[PDB]
Amino acid sequence: SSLYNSHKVYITADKQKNGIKANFQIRHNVEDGSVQLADHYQQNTPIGDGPVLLPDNHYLSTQSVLSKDPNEKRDHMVLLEFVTAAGISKGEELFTGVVPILVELDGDVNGHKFRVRGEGEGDATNGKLTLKFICTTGKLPVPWPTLVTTLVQCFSRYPDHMKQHDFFKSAMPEGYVQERTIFFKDDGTYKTRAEVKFEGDTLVNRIELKGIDFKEDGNILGHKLEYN
């Protein structure tokens, strides 16, 4: 536990697929005080074919807050994110105000199938967003914390001198495809495909997620994380 807790998402351009790839590690605290590594490998490809801002090597800086809603009785997660870029087109046009967000997730983990819906709003200029997530099929079979990365980087606050490295906004509203492989040390793997685009003016992240080789007693299937 540190007080100022930034996770850095390292972004390198992929001239190859006209997109970007990314690499970072996530850490989850376990109840017994140890730590679960979760290695992320990410691929992002534009959906249209229009001009999109390929960038130079920078990183995103992310802080997450996870809370509950004392009223709400379903299995849920309230989340605030605070993202801003660092290291030194105009899809950026709609990211001027407070934008509505819908997030839909279809997921299979070792056969345990589930969905998650989420709504809220983001504010790219302040690099902030709020979202309430409900598990619309009941209990979540994995810990909420492990889904956070999978559950809209277009909302990062890009400083003025980096404004041309905002691939995410550039490729809007045709949007982009986000794919991650996520390796949990000594346990299973997630694969994710997601499409992020505008449907109306609300912003939508629709996701499929498959979860392979988990230990039905490991930290994930065993809900052994600090946020419980």
From Swiss-Prot:
It comes from Aequorea victoria. The keyword Isomerase does not apply. Contains a chromophore consisting of modified amino acid residues. Maturation of the chromophore requires nothing other than molecular oxygen. InterPro entries: GFP, GFP-related, Green_fluorescent_prot. Changing residue 35 to A: In mut2.1; shifts fluorescence lifetime from 3.03 to 2.50 ns. This is Green fluorescent protein. Keywords: Chromophore, Luminescence, Photoprotein. Changing residue 187 to E: In mut1.27; shifts fluorescence lifetime from 3.03 to 2.85 ns. Changing residue 6 to P: Increases fluorescence at warmer temperatures such as 37 degrees Celsius.
